[PDB]
Amino acid sequence: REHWATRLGLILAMAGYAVDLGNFLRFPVQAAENGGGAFMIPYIIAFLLVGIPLMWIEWAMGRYGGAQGHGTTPAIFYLLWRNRFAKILGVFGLWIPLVVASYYVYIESWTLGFAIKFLVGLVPEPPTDPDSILRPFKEFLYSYIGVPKGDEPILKPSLFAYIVFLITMFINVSILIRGISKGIERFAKIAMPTLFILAVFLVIRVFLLETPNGTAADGLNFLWTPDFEKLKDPGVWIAAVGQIFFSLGLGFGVLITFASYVRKDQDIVLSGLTAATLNEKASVILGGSISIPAAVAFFGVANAVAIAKAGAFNLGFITLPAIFSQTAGGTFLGFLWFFLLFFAGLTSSIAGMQGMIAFLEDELKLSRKHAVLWTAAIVFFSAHLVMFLNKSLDEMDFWATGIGVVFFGLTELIIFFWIFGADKAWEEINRGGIIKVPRIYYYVMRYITPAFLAVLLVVWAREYIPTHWTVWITRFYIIGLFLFLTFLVFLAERRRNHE
Ligand SMILES: CN(C)C[C@@H](c1ccc(O)cc1)C1(O)CCCCC1
Ligand code: NA
Ligand code: NA
């Protein structure tokens, strides 16, 4: 079985997974709308009661599984719990990241395409007034995506957008086909520093931004000024717990698959805690210092609320490109920005596609080459739904990363720490550990963590159990995908009985 070569590379691959566009866009937006600096209170609390506990558990299940030649949850859940239902629930953790891959790789391709357009200077050049500056870029994006101009829910992405998507897919395949160490790990050792340099450079450049409307200091001010009165809102406490899931990448079955390449007695306690810390530093230090401050510096702290409510996607693909076009050498600033984003996604997308690569290897005994190609073929195919069907993307993201990760996360807890046995599990976590997990965490993992997750489930339920008919197409497809994965798992166990 493949293994990580260096302890360092392991951490950089894991942190590479967790560090994403959410660090630079999603996290800052959430913080600004939920108490600013006061949002750190329920965020840190969720990091300690939910994030860290769940993270160690996924590392634990991963390594425990990897030692027995299985990297995915259909096999692993069966090992912790020998039921038929256990294999079935495990499919979710093979299904979730595949659904995400169907739209993520595509969104990742946008950043690549934008980065190219910005580098060669093929971008709009306005003109005055905010709507007169934003609109040329709002249109720049819509022509790339192919946002419907009529009542039809049909996207018509440009030939360039589609071609970059191909190139992007090809780039993912290139790394993945070289394997865990020589491919993913080797790239993590290059990408993560390159990422850090780009972030710092942009951070410095943003702090020097001075416009008649404001400064970057005003941005860091508006963002970090604590509004404790919002801490009374449960919704803030829910947003924090949800954000932790998103920022760390819990409930996707990726950490599990990665940790299955960790050797049987190698440390997962300190290593995981480290990669988790790298991610959080990248969020609060780098991500919170670029997007929002620049937006406030140019549009004033007066629009700082409106900017935050405009959504993370607008901030990163319309607002920030528009601000750059109005700065000295801003067209190159746009390129660094998108190239920063592109790598941040590319380190995450190779990580998410590894789960399917692992399954085909471990359970269907495919060569790494075949597993990678058939995985790419599936992800490439499904993406056409995201590319051509309007709001298809939103529907996949709702199911896969709304119900999916929070439900499947709780399923990970119960199976490992309740069914498999809390005591056996606690040993499985701490075994070979450079440092040991604090004794108090045994209670958190057993009660507090699943309590929070259950509340997030019911709170999601009541609010979200309550769209155009075309969603049924996306629902039809993702349901079908689950069925198809169920079939492969079925074929996997029929092959094993023969041998
Ligand atoms: C949150 N992280 C770490 C990135 C993940 C993700 C999941 C959902 C989403 O909306 C964006 C990214 C992702 O890496 C999961 C595997 C498939 C690619 C995306
Ligand atoms: Na993150
Ligand atoms: Na990444």
The string of DSSP codes covering 127-149 is ---HHHHHHHHHHHHHHHHT--S
Nearest to 91 by CA among 396, 485, 492, 494: 485
> What gap in Å lies between CA 391 and CA 383, rounded to an integer?
13
Q: How far apart are CA 218 and CA 292, in angstroms?
A: 10
CB 291 within 8 A of CB 32: no
Phi-psi region at 421: left, alpha or beta (left = phi > 0; alpha = psi -120 to 50) = left
Residue 98 CB coordination number (10 Å) = 25
DSSP 294-337: HHHHHH-GGGHHHHHHT-HHHIIIIIHHHHHTTSTTHHHHHHHH
Q: How far apart are CA 291 and CA 295, in angstroms?
A: 6
7 is in an annotated binding site: no
Q: Which amino acid is at 31?
A: A
Which residues face 389 on adjacent strands? 154
Q: In b/e form, how buried is each residue of 21-41, taking b as 16+ CB within 10 angstroms?
A: bbbbbbbbbbbbbbbbebbbb
Query: Cα 345 to chain center, whole Å?
Result: 8
Q: Based on the number of CB atoms within 10 Å of its own CB, is 448 exposed (0-12), middle (13-18) or buried (19 or more)?
A: middle
The resolution in Å comes to: 2.8
Ion ligand 3: protein residues whose beta carbon lies under 5 Å: 16, 19-20, 344, 347-348
The count of structural domains within the chain is 1
Residue 454 gets which letter from DSSP? H
Which residues form the domain of 65?
A: 1-499
**Cα separation, 339 vs 118, whole angstroms:** 10
Maximum alpha-carbon separation in the chain: 74
Ligand 1 pocket: which residues have CB below 6 Å?
Answer: 17-18, 20, 22, 97, 100-101, 104, 246, 249, 252, 254, 348-349, 351-352, 397, 401
- Distance, CA of 405 to CA of 199 (rounded, Å): 28
Bridge partners, 154 (sequence order): 389
- What three-state secondary structure class fits 165? helix
The answer, yes or no, to whether the previous bond of 127 is cis (omega within 30 of 0) is: yes
d(CA 331, CA 209): 15
How far apart are alpha carbons 50 and 186 in whole angstroms? Answer: 31
Burial 305-344 (b: 16+ CB within 10 A, else e): eebbebebebbbbbbbbbbbbebeebbebbbbbbbbbbbb
Nearest residue to 111 (alpha-carbon basis) of 333, 453, 350, 339: 339
The angle formed by the CA atoms of residues 382, 396 and 451, to the nearest 5 degrees, is 140
**Cβ-proximal residues to 219 (8 Å cutoff; 6+ apart), any chain:** 206, 292, 293, 294, 295, 296, 297, 301, 304
- Nearest 5°: phi and psi at 470? -70, -10
Nearest CA to ligand 1 atom 2: 249
3-state secondary structure of 389: strand
| List of residues 6+ apart from 469 with CB closer than 8 A | none
Nearest to 376 by CA among 20, 105, 52: 105
396 touches 116 (CB < 8 A): no
Please give the full DSSP string across 370-384, using - where no structure is assigned.
Answer: HHHHHHHHHHHHHHH
Own/partner pairs, 324-328, CB within 8 angstroms, 24+ separation: 324/118, 325/123, 325/124, 325/125, 325/126, 325/133, 325/137, 326/126, 326/133, 326/298, 327/209
Which atom in ligand 1 lies closest to the alpha carbon of residue 400? 8
Sign of CA pseudo-dihedral 433, 351, 400, 62:
negative
Please give the C-alpha separations between residue 189 and each of 120, 134, 176, 184, 198, in angstroms, as whole numbers: 28, 37, 15, 9, 15
Nearest Cα to Cα of residue 488 among 95, 172, 180, 176: 95
What approach was used to elucidate this structure?
X-ray
Amino acid at 384: H
Sign of CA dihedral 363, 364, 366, 368: negative
CA-nearest of 115, 33, 103, 143 to 320 is 115
Nearest CA to ligand 1 atom 10: 397
